[PDB]
Amino acid sequence: PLLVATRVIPPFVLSNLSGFSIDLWRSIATQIGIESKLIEYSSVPELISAIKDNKVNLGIAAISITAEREQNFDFSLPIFASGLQIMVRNGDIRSIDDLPGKVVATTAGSTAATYLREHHISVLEVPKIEEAYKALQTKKADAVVFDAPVLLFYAANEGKGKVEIVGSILREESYGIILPNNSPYRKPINQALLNLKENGTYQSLYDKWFDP
Amino acid sequence: PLLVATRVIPPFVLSNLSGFSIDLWRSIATQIGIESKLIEYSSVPELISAIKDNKVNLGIAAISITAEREQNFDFSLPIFASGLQIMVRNGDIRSIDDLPGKVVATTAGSTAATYLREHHISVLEVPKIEEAYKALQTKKADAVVFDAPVLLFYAANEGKGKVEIVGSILREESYGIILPNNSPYRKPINQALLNLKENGTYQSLYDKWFDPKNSLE
Amino acid sequence: PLLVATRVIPPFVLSNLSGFSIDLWRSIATQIGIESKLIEYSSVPELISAIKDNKVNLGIAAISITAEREQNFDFSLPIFASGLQIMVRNGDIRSIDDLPGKVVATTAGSTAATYLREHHISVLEVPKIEEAYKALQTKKADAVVFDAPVLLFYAANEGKGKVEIVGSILREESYGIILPNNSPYRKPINQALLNLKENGTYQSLYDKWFDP
Numbered sequence A, C: 001p002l003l004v005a006t007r008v009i010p011p012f013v014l015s016n017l018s019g020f021s022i023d024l025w026r027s028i029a030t031q032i033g034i035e036s037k038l039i040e041y042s043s044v045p046e047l048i049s050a051i052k053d054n055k056v057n058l059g060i061a062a063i064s065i066t067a068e069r070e071q072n073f074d075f076s077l078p079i080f081a082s083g084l085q086i087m088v089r090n091g092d093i094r095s096i097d098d099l100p101g102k103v104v105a106t107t108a109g110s111t112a113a114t115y116l117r118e119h120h121i122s123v124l125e126v127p128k129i130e131e132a133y134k135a136l137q138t139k140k141a142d143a144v145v146f147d148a149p150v151l152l153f154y155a156a157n158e159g160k161g162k163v164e165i166v167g168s169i170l171r172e173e174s175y176g177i178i179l180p181n182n183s184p185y186r187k188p189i190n191q192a193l194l195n196l197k198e199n200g201t202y203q204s205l206y207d208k209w210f211d212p
Numbered sequence B: 001p002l003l004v005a006t007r008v009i010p011p012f013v014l015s016n017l018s019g020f021s022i023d024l025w026r027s028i029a030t031q032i033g034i035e036s037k038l039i040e041y042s043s044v045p046e047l048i049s050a051i052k053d054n055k056v057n058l059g060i061a062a063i064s065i066t067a068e069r070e071q072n073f074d075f076s077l078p079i080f081a082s083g084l085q086i087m088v089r090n091g092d093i094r095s096i097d098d099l100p101g102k103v104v105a106t107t108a109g110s111t112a113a114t115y116l117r118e119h120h121i122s123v124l125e126v127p128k129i130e131e132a133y134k135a136l137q138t139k140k141a142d143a144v145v146f147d148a149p150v151l152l153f154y155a156a157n158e159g160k161g162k163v164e165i166v167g168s169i170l171r172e173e174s175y176g177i178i179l180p181n182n183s184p185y186r187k188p189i190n191q192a193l194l195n196l197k198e199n200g201t202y203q204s205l206y207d208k209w210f211d212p213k214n215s216l217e
């Protein structure tokens, strides 16, 4: 059976195991005709090490496809469109223009953390995005920078009436299923994914988590 | 010097060779240190066969990534977000629901011809994109179904005030660079494209050939 | 019980089920002592996928034996000699040389379709041949290219006085019973067919359906 590394980050991955990426991988696994075990990891870099250490066959959650990651690993066709975005409390912070000199929360080992560090912005790195939302509400942080879809999902729910997404996408990124190089499952994964997109399953799955 | 198959389809590929894909490939190639020679093909299947028979090293144009093509060929990361859309003369056709029982023109060997056939719609598969537009005017066809980006360009230009685009995207498709299986150029192309997006080059190219508001994410 | 895929296409397969291919299959099945269940399909490609999906054990109608099909599937010995033919309204169009720039109607998924596309002729691909004939009479199409035996049958029947078969055979094609690769029924069917061809049964069936 295929060993699949995952990471908790709603609405793509939730535990109690559910979410967009979970339903998607399952539809993909069945599409191919193989069984798989989901192994949770605390962060993206940990999930990546699992790939590099050959502990799992692939990884899926809300993994950004980046040049640096593509350099040492491989990816399937994109499974979702994302991008970095700023979120503030419900001001003096309206865009990236205002970030220098502020404290911004985000998850450790994320493309957001890397982007913030490159811009020399003071960062409060937390293990789970949920803790960043708390830092913002408690005012420990002045803003949050993370993947647009995740922030929007939050604003649409728990964050309702308590936050605001400001500015434009600071960095366009798409999600993908990460794999080791020369993986024999990349093509069957892409193949299945394309089928799901061509038969209407991807759409149904999309609406379930992003279209009420 | 790599042999690169291309197919004329504005505004991605134009010839008087320019266009969005022409500029994108040039950047990717210049960044990788690769030099190339572009070879023109008359249709998508004709371009695919050149790849299949090892007559070229890869191909780029407005090539939809599909399950069927992915089965025998490889694709880079998507280079564009596109999809099929309906176009009629400026009626009784406003959406997919209005196609069955009608005749829709499109290019032979296109994802649009496939979509139409599979949905049991009568399709006039022409060998030349321009002939599809004609078939609509001549009324030989009731409507045309083709890539949205291409129809918009034709509409805002040569077909301005003579045609109209209707309904939403029938099916979303992304374009990619098609490569032979196990191609050693796949990863470096992906790496190049990713950097081009990260440094803004991609963004600038897109805005050069398209209108920001029409982006399909 | 063997599942047999069929497609309605007179005079080989007609509904009222009869026709040359239907009578031939019955004689073959009776001889091999096999019980069969017929399943109708809307197009040749649909019938083919039924074979590929193991949804049927074989297929018989007016199925052309081509390299592309033989590469992915198998065939019995030919059950008929056919070929592509041009039909016009009741002159100028007489060969492929007059088809450039013309609209030629035929069924979607057929060898005629593939032939026309490969020769860069505009082809109106309809799901039902009946539409092809209508398009010709309505002048939407300038001609129709389809299987000679089928067009001849039409011209003698519903088409009498409104159509004309012109020119010679564009491309010779034989019909066969299509099967999945490694099919254990190929040889017995072949054996059965040969016995019918050798004891006069084939001749009788041929005369019954193709005698002027």
Ligand SMILES: N[C@@H](CCC(=O)O)C(=O)O
Pocket (backbone or CB within 6 Å): A007, A009, A043, A044, A062, A063, A064, A107, A108, A109, A110, A111, A112, A147
């Ligand atoms: N898309 C982000 C998610 C990071 C996280 O899950 O914390 C990345 O791949 O870096």
Ligand SMILES: N[C@@H](CCC(=O)O)C(=O)O
Pocket (backbone or CB within 6 Å): B007, B009, B043, B044, B062, B063, B064, B065, B107, B108, B109, B110, B111, B112, B147
């Ligand atoms: N995006 C279409 C283009 C068809 C064409 O260029 O004719 C495809 O890949 O089929």
Ligand SMILES: N[C@@H](CCC(=O)O)C(=O)O
Pocket (backbone or CB within 6 Å): C007, C009, C043, C044, C062, C063, C064, C107, C108, C109, C110, C111, C112, C147
């Ligand atoms: N002999 C044709 C028949 C097509 C049809 O029945 O639609 C073929 O095998 O393609």
